[PDB]
Amino acid sequence: GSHMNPPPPETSNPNKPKRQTNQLQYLLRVVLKTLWKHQFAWPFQQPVDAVKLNLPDYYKIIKTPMDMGTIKKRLENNYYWNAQECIQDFNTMFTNCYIYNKPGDDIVLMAEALEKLFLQKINELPTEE
């Protein structure tokens, strides 16, 4: 864990109120499960290691990082109060990719395939009950 990478996003904080909702259960059991096993998931399964990738400007450009490894921890460790917080984390991850990388770079095609799957699953996010 290089000192030249930022600390990862928060995944544990007892002062933040937590809740289980049926929508958060769906985000873990359906949405994360679907995207995590995709052939194109691997670049998104952990924080960007800017040192290992030789991208010293990455965290100069991307000031709101997010990745599916962080989202998985947040879902499995009940970090959220609602589904909108978790949806926003997925959307942040995709937008990071689209703002850092050139359109049609391989990483962008990979993100776009995951985002298409994401959108289909979020259109079926169940009514909160």
UniProtKB/Swiss-Prot annotation:
The protein's role, per its UniProt record: Chromatin reader protein that recognizes and binds acetylated histones and plays a key role in transmission of epigenetic memory across cell divisions and transcription regulation. Remains associated with acetylated chromatin throughout the entire cell cycle and provides epigenetic memory for postmitotic G1 gene transcription by preserving acetylated chromatin status and maintaining high-order chromatin structure. During interphase, plays a key role in regulating the transcription of signal-inducible genes by associating with the P-TEFb complex and recruiting it to promoters.
Residue stretches in coiled coil: none
Locations listed in the record: Nucleus; Chromosome
UniProt cross-link Glycyl lysine isopeptide (Lys-Gly) (interchain with G-Cter in SUMO2), position: 60
Residues flagged as site, Acetylated histone binding: 101
Protein name: Bromodomain-containing protein 4
Record family assignment: Belongs to the BET family.
Domain notes: The NET domain mediates interaction with a number of chromatin proteins involved in transcription regulation (NSD3, JMJD6, CHD4, GLTSCR1 and ATAD5).
UniProt effect for mutating residue 101 to A: Abolishes binding to acetylated histones
Record's subunit section: Interacts with p53/TP53; the interaction is direct. Interacts (via CTD region) with CDK9 and CCNT1, acting as an associated component of P-TEFb complex. Interacts with RELA (when acetylated at 'Lys-310'). Interacts (via NET domain) with NSD3, CHD4, BICRA and ATAD5. The interaction with BICRA bridges BRD4 to the GBAF complex. Interacts (via NET domain) with JMJD6 (via JmjC and N-terminal domains); the interaction is stronger in presence of ssRNA and recruits JMJD6 on distal enhancers. Interacts with NSD3. Interacts with NIPBL. (Microbial infection) Interacts with bovine papillomavirus type 1 regulatory protein E2. This interactions may serve for the tethering of viral genomes to host mitotic chromosomes allowing successful partitioning of the viral genome during cell division.
Tissue-specific expression: Ubiquitously expressed.
Recorded disease: Cornelia de Lange syndrome 6: A form of Cornelia de Lange syndrome, a clinically heterogeneous developmental disorder associated with malformations affecting multiple systems. It is characterized by facial dysmorphisms, abnormal hands and feet, growth delay, cognitive retardation, hirsutism, gastroesophageal dysfunction and cardiac, ophthalmologic and genitourinary anomalies. CDLS6 inheritance is autosomal dominant.
Misc. comment: JQ1, a thieno-triazolo-1,4-diazepine derivative, and I-BET, a benzodiazepine derivative, have been tested on tumors with success. Treatment with GSK1210151A (I-BET151, a I-BET derivative) has strong effets on mixed lineage leukemia and promotes myeloid differentiation and leukemia stem-cell depletion.
PTM section of the record: Phosphorylation by CK2 disrupt the intramolecular binding between the bromo domain 2 and the NPS region and promotes binding between the NPS and the BID regions, leading to activate the protein and promote binding to acetylated histones. In absence of phosphorylation, BRD4 does not localize to p53/TP53 target gene promoters, phosphorylation promoting recruitment to p53/TP53 target promoters.
Outcome, altering residue 106 to G: Found in a patient with a neurodevelopmental syndrome; uncertain significance
Whole sequence portion shown: 44 to 168 of 1362
Domain Bromo positions: 19-125
